[PDB]
């Protein structure tokens, strides 16, 4: 009984947050592109610094 109640507590949250995978997917694509830009900027900055 207690286990089942816990599962039925979690499962709606699982269902609630499953939909976020795709918004997360584009989110991480954009975020990683941004970090790529940040790394490029950092590298170029250091490159000129000298």
């Amino acid at each position: 009984w207690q286990s089942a109640r816990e599962l039925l507590r979690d499962w709606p949250s699982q269902r609630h947050l499953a939909d976020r995978v795709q918004p997360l997917r584009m989110r991480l694509s954009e975020l990683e592109q941004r970090l790529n830009n940040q790394q490029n900027a950092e590298r170029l900055l250091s490159e000129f610094c000298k």
Binding site: W1, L8, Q14, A18, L28, L31, L35
Partner: protein, 49 residues
Amino acid sequence: LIDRVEEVREEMDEAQEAARFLQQHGSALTKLEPMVAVLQSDPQQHEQL
């Protein structure tokens, strides 16, 4: 230095695992949810009750 891509990727792991578990046991959970209360009553425990 947000470095949240690690965080977003962990969120992806969690959400994709949640979707996979939903697929894995969605039917079992749905068939369990309308009649959950029975788990509190075990046949012999019904007599002891």
